Design a protein around this ligand. Structure first.
Ligand SMILES: CC(=O)N[C@H]1[C@H](O[C@@H]2[C@@H](O)[C@H](O)O[C@H](CO)[C@@H]2O)O[C@H](CO)[C@@H](O[C@@H]2O[C@H](CO[C@]3(C(=O)O)C[C@H](O)[C@@H](NC(C)=O)[C@H]([C@H](O)[C@H](O)CO)O3)[C@H](O)[C@H](O)[C@H]2O)[C@@H]1O
Ligand SMILES: CC(=O)N[C@H]1[C@H](O[C@@H]2[C@@H](O)[C@H](O)O[C@H](CO)[C@@H]2O)O[C@H](CO)[C@@H](O[C@@H]2O[C@H](CO[C@]3(C(=O)O)C[C@H](O)[C@@H](NC(C)=O)[C@H]([C@H](O)[C@H](O)CO)O3)[C@H](O)[C@H](O)[C@H]2O)[C@@H]1O
Ligand SMILES: CC(=O)N[C@@H]1[C@@H](O)[C@H](O[C@@H]2O[C@H](CO[C@]3(C(=O)O)C[C@H](O)[C@@H](NC(C)=O)[C@H]([C@H](O)[C@H](O)CO)O3)[C@H](O)[C@H](O)[C@H]2O)[C@@H](CO)O[C@H]1O
Ligand SMILES: *[C@@H]1O[C@H](CO)[C@@H](O)[C@H](O)[C@H]1NC(C)=O
Ligand SMILES: *[C@@H]1O[C@H](CO)[C@@H](O)[C@H](O)[C@H]1NC(C)=O
Ligand SMILES: *[C@@H]1O[C@H](CO)[C@@H](O)[C@H](O)[C@H]1NC(C)=O
Ligand SMILES: *[C@@H]1O[C@H](CO)[C@@H](O)[C@H](O)[C@H]1NC(C)=O
Ligand SMILES: *[C@@H]1O[C@H](CO)[C@@H](O)[C@H](O)[C@H]1NC(C)=O
Ligand SMILES: *[C@@H]1O[C@H](CO)[C@@H](O)[C@H](O)[C@H]1NC(C)=O
Ligand SMILES: *[C@@H]1O[C@H](CO)[C@@H](O)[C@H](O)[C@H]1NC(C)=O
Ligand SMILES: *[C@@H]1O[C@H](CO)[C@@H](O)[C@H](O)[C@H]1NC(C)=O
Ligand SMILES: *[C@@H]1O[C@H](CO)[C@@H](O)[C@H](O)[C@H]1NC(C)=O
Lengths: 485, 484, 484
């Protein structure tokens, strides 16, 4: 006749590492690292991204003939660009502050193309001959759709003086450019005048562009270049152009309303008609876990990126194949409990109160570590050019330093807390064993294995009497007194 | 006749959370989060700020007529500027490298205006016509006080060639500028010469400026523009100017002595006459706590900013089981005993056990506070509209450290509070063990944290049990015959 | 008559602090902070540094006569410049994007100087008169060796139009330059061409340079200046120069193959002919420790820099559940017993319990060391005077991380030290409870961790209780009357 107190055992193969012990198989565990993604590019917080297909932001904006004339998506959360975009700037050249303009255009709440300077405005210049082979539409020479390459008319290029007053209530993005000639003959042939200039003026802008006529390498079959420039014209301000040649004049402009900032994501995954709080170039993370290892360049409210394959928190008990030699595989209905083997039968019992008290606390342990990382803001990727490598290395030092801080702190926290959890489980059993110690002072002997040697007989009902804390010690005290022999 | 053990209880309503348990009332606690500021702007480590009031750095350096002429103070710890300063470049234009100038001027050990090029130095040029409505003073057109807008004299503008050798043993901040005419007629009207230049050269400078005669939009009623430039002439170098028009010449310069940095603060709070090691745009912080939630953009040896409303550390016992709860009747300690005797009944406290615990939890709180390193850091936003990528980097940095310090501080608190509550429980159970070992069969294990005396213990006996000097041989026979 | 459960004591003078207790003398400890360096500049992962000595990256690159040697290292891992290199640009001027060039050049896999434009290519110009006293060689006017200063021939300077196609499969770093003369006479007496230009064109480059004839200050005896420029010619592109005069033309160029990044180190210590994974400006760190306090500016796979001077982890026990403890006699374990009978008295140790403690504390120490993730990094200052806002961002980032690692590492030591000392206390209590449970009735507990055998037990039964093989029915209640 004896009563026993032990812990639970199941068939789990999951192991956890603690600060002092490694590879400790436990009954229950919880990974706080997310490794699952959608494999698709989703909407970010309800807004659809801008997916440019093998075209760059410059190509799309300036109107490369090989790009969708109108995306007519007025709003986007992020811009999706392929790694090495194909079409780009068909006529060789450059766009000023490109990387800044891209940051400006990463998240837009209104985008609408408008016609600010119609070709009718150029009565003494040729608007139809400004085309090239480097800019093709269906094999045919063409040019950027949103600008106008003006050339001489009647061997004469009269000085242009045109102004546009932004009557709209929205800011305007206005793009224009300068054509660099190749020799003096080419200069006079397109623009009668040999010495040329472009002057651009707004309330904040004061620009003097002058063409550079030199020998250059051939790119897309052209040795000349075209440098482009942009400005943001505020409501009720006016832009003032003046030139006598080499002018790539604006024809269309863009109404921008910008309330937020994002980044240009470089990815090739397809739009999945989904929504997500966190987008990575490889797929979307819908998770609440504090840490992830999917991809560094996330956008949105994301878990912290760590260099870890697994971060498993123990939520259970040491599994089995110290007074309590091991756990009971037969106690399938509890975490802490009792065992009896009286004259009538032998059975396994579970301590509901002690069990729930621990299940609540251990889940509170996981939820605390999970939910205290409520610090989730917005994020960005890569945005620096070839002569900005020092700032790029700055961003990399930062990302790596944060990588090291989160990974050390997360891996150590799991190790420190898992040691405490397993200890917390050990202390719970010992207090239960001390509960029956005080209930059966001399009416039972200390066997030492977590079991108690009943001098007197207990029925299955007396066993539930030691359990339930409903046992009378003087009821059987004299029987134990005689059992001493 | 019985003896018991029990922990102290208060009227405290303070609640702490642990890693496994939430909303646990305690008798004592401490918040390691600073939440208060003095509501004023103060001297930082003894040095008064420079409060440009509705003036920008540009309009104070150049002489805007609506800004303060004199530099009252030769040194400052930080600059305070309003959000959208009203008096800035009154004539429309620009100041080169303005953010870097601002950063340079943000903390200065010595600033002193000096006249470098007297207005007498310009005999064949006009020194008095160079005003504008855009820069008004007392109802009349004026201009920046620290430079000169030279104009033609007798319909002629002789090519200027002037040099200034720095003989001041300290660096000099020198400013000049270029005037952008509006049309070829304006140009000859102010400077007879239609094509003009400005050549500035030092030991390190090689600059050539040319006006941009072009149609611009009216700002402050002018379509002209004035671009200003600057430089730091070293203590034995000379600056050489040459121009034949459009020259905004330097008249005054500043002797600079720079030994530290500390960004421009944007606040509208008034200057209280106080000192602080830590200044925010809303107020100053006088604290030794590790963490705070006052403002992101501090200056000085400040606590770490976190996104937390409170960081409370439990330093006491759980407030009102095996001990059946706490004793609100206990007044003179944290761990105590209960005499229940026919001679007398009362409460007593373990003097050493309590003091060992209050010293430890005090060491726990003091350790968390004292291990924080405070480095002088000036957090400010110093990037213009075409510098938004670098601003994003700074944001990511600020935001990352915020997320680290908040996560650590929140989890440190939860974790150490679970340990603090179990540390009180272990110290209590050790007192139960001391009494249990001294009286095995002489006392009875009631199980509710109390002992049942078979023997009748004097109030002198009761102290001996606490003193750890009970003699089981004294009346072990009493218990033998009592067990019936 | 007595057996006792006690712990080890030694003669260690090492103290560690804990979250609740300070200056706790322990038996064994481990400092996880590295403080020692060999005092030499070493190779990084088997690659030699490039130790420019009193020469700048521009002097070495452009071929300063005073620079001691031509190109000698074909691959490097980092560059070593002296704080203020003495040589640099012997003729006064500048080099465009010098700090971005120094970044690219910081870690180069392949580097080879090649002759791209021989002097035979300048028939109608003079390639021999392009010298200056500023570049002095051996007491004689000289000049940069990798670039040629072209001068008129027969009072004529015919326009240069020249193209170099990159026929190599490696990229080519090409440097050219422009000379700013001082007055219109010097311009004619050197280039016989009053208005001059320099156009440089590649597949990506489209430059126009025009001299600035202007009064400047004397540097190294020259009021003139030379501004140099560089570009990277890709493997099948060609560069095209055109120039009326003032051309400092490329003679030599460098084959570049770049496959990783580093930074430039400012140090004066010398090569030790050693190899390391981690390099500071004062020496090299060969350590697995997670934290170090040597220098902030490290290149390589380094530990985290912290401000602390001691991070001592505790691996043993307190030094003078036995109340006194402090058994200086025990030498072969941490936990053990002590016997007392007619044969004699001596100390014994528990092998199974002690070993699991040593396994545990060392696995903790290893876990703290081993869980640190080290990335290759290069901490250096790469910003100029008009970049001090970026420098501050760097400083804030560095200083922000220093504060993060210092606090967390300090609390880690403190928290885990106190938990380890207390877990050892649980282990000696596990031994006492095992002994007390077996001696159910035949023995009394004295209170000091010891047990009084009423029925005196000799050497033979001491091993049975120790081994857990104690036979309770074998000898029992022999002398109940010993208690009387
Ligand atoms: C307008 C044109 O086609 N010019 C070509 C030139 O013809 C001259 C003619 O226009 C003029 O009236 O009379 C002179 C003789 O007095 C010439 O007959 O002949 C050159 C020699 O072959 C051509 O150069 C070639 O240009 C090629 C590129 O063609 C395009 C281009 O597709 O980019 C043709 C475009 O029509 C033209 N654009 C405009 C707006 O007129 C451009 C433009 O000239 C350049 O892009 C500006 O730099 O050029 C190849 O580059 C080829 O290698 C080159 O020989 C002239 O195109
Ligand atoms: C010096 C002056 O007042 N010029 C005004 C000009 O008068 C000319 C006269 O100076 C010359 O001798 O003879 C010609 C005819 O042969 C003229 O009579 O007349 C212009 C037409 O109204 C004025 O333009 C107006 O300028 C306004 C601004 O006035 C100020 C200013 O307050 O900024 C007046 C200042 O005295 C003057 N500064 C200097 C140093 O002389 C400036 C200066 O001209 C500009 O700032 C340079 O761009 O202008 C308004 O802008 C108004 O809209 C405009 O019509 C000439 O001011
Ligand atoms: C060859 C000669 O005699 N030139 C005369 C000048 O030497 C003299 O002005 C003086 O120039 C001095 C430095 O002389 C060099 C130099 O840079 O070291 C000597 C070089 O031969 C010469 N290089 C060329 C390509 O001609 C060089 C060059 O002229 C300048 O560097 C152009 O910037 O000058 C020194 O700086 C003296 O302080 C200065 O007086 C002038 C004026 O008298 O007449 C020249 O004939
Ligand atoms: C463990 O027990 C569950 C009970 O449903 C069973 O489904 C599962 O297959 C078992 N796993 C192994 C490895 O036996
Ligand atoms: C340089 O060489 C290759 C092969 O000869 C040729 O394809 C290329 O066009 C050349 N580039 C120039 C600018 O001459
Ligand atoms: C643009 O139009 C409005 C209304 O006619 C006017 O007030 C404003 O001054 C104009 N801006 C410019 C630069 O012309
Ligand atoms: C996202 O994760 C939560 C649990 O973290 C889950 O309940 C939810 O179904 C997931 N979202 C989608 C679209 O499946
Ligand atoms: C709690 O007790 C103290 C005196 O011990 C008293 O000053 C204080 O007002 C009391 N607080 C409450 C809420 O009763
Ligand atoms: C400035 O003054 C001192 C003494 O007159 C002189 O030694 C120095 O060369 C001068 N510096 C310049 C750039 O003229
Ligand atoms: C700052 O705080 C301390 C501690 O509360 C206080 O004694 C003092 O009055 C305050 N004084 C100053 C100068 O900040
Ligand atoms: C402590 O004992 C060791 C021998 O193991 C000895 O080398 C050392 O000098 C001793 N230190 C002191 C302070 O006695
Ligand atoms: C680094 O330290 C260990 C231990 O002292 C040593 O065995 C090893 O030789 C050292 N390696 C180098 C390259 O110095």
């Amino acid at each position: 006749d004896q009563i026993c107190i032990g812990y639970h055992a199941n068939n789990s193969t999951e192991q956890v590492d603690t600060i002092m012990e490694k590879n400790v198989t436990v009954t229950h565990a919880q990974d706080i690292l997310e490794k699952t993604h959608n494999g698709k590019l989703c909407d970010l917080n309800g807004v659809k991204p801008l997916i440019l297909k093998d075209c760059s932001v410059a190509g799309w904006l300036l109107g490369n003939p090989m790009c969708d004339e109108f995306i007519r998506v007025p709003e986007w959360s992020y811009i999706v660009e392929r790694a090495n975009p194909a079409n780009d700037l068909c006529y060789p050249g450059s766009l000023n502050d490109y990387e800044e303009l891209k940051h400006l255009l990463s998240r837009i709440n209104h985008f609408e193309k408008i016609l600010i300077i119609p070709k009718s405005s150029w009565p003494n210049h040729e608007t139809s001959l400004g085309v090239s082979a480097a800019c093709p539409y269906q094999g045919a020479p063409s040019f950027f759709r949103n600008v106008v390459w003006l050339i001489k008319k009647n061997d004469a290029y009269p000085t242009i003086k045109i102004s546009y007053n932004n009557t709209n209530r929205e800011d305007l993005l206005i793009l224009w450019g300068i054509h660099h000639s190749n020799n003096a003959e080419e200069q006079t042939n397109l623009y009668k005048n040999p010495t040329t200039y472009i002057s651009v003026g707004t309330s904040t802008l004061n620009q003097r562009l002058v063409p550079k006529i030199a020998t250059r390498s051939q790119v897309n079959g052209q040795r000349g270049r075209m440098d482009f420039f942009w400005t943001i014209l505020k409501p009720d301000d006016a832009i003032h152009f003046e030139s006598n040649g080499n002018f790539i004049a604006p024809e269309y402009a863009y109404k921008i309303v910008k309330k937020g900032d994002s980044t240009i994501m470089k990815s090739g995954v397809e739009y999945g008609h989904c929504n997500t709080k966190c987008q990575t170039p490889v797929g979307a993370i819908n998770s609440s876990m504090p840490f992830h290892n999917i991809h560094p360049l996330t956008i949105g409210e994301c878990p912290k990126y760590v260099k870890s394959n697994k971060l498993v928190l123990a939520t259970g008990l040491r599994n089995s194949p110290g007074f309590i030699e091991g756990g009971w595989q037969g106690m399938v209905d509890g975490w802490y409990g009792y065992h009896h083997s009286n004259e009538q039968g032998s059975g396994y019992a579970a301590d509901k109160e002690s069990t729930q008290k621990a299940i609540d606390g251990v889940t509170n342990k996981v939820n605390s570590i999970i939910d205290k990382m409520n610090t989730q803001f917005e994020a960005v990727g890569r945005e620096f050019n070839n002569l900005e490598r020092r700032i790029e290395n700055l961003n990399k030092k930062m990302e790596d330093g944060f990588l090291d801080v989160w990974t050390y702190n997360a891996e150590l926290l799991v190790l420190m807390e898992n040691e405490r959890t397993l200890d917390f489980h050990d202390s719970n059993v010992k207090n239960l064993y001390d509960k029956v110690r005080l209930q059966l002072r001399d009416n039972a002997k200390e066997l030492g294995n977590g079991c108690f040697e009943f001098y007197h007989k207990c029925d299955n009902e007396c066993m539930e009497s030691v359990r339930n804390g409903t046992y009378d010690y003087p009821q059987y005290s004299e029987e134990a007194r005689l059992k001493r022999e």
